[PDB]
Design a protein around this ligand. Structure first.
Ligand SMILES: [Cl-]
Ligand SMILES: [Cl-]
Ligand code: NA
Length: 129
């Protein structure tokens, strides 16, 4: 499913992400825009052979099981395919664990390079929240 901007903001808000660990909603929408272009079915393969899954491009080396990343962990205890559903619950729950592990949203390279230090509130401007 390809979310609209405000549609995704509202779904993320319902799932507890607004100001989660101090990151306002615009940060999460901005990261999703540049990680996946709001597409829950996005996948991308990394050089080490792991794969990134879903709206927030969560990585199989640490966070989910895809049966093809030897030596990896499954810290969200989830098949990676669950992160591709039109229901973003699994992705949001796993993202909460990632952002809590000490490095904040810097875990998302696109957030660090394209959202951090920008006017992220612009990503939720005009939405009914
Ligand atoms: Cl915001
Ligand atoms: Cl932080
Ligand atoms: Na894994």
């Amino acid at each position: 499913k390809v979310f609209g901007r405000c549609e995704l903001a509202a779904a993320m808000k319902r799932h507890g992400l607004d100001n989660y660990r101090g990151y306002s909603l615009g940060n999460w929408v901005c990261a999703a825009k540049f990680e996946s272009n709001f597409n829950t079915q996005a996948t991308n393969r990394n050089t080490d052979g792991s794969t990134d899954y879903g709206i927030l491009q969560i990585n199989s080396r640490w966070w989910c099981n895809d049966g093809r990343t030897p030596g990896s962990r499954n810290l969200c205890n989830i098949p990676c395919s669950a992160l591709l559903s039109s229901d973003i619950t699994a992705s949001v729950n796993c993202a909460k664990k990632i952002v809590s592990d000490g490095n904040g949203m810097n875990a998302w390279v696109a957030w660090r390079n394209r959202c951090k230090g920008t006017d992220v509130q612009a990503w939720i401007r005009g939405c009914r929240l």
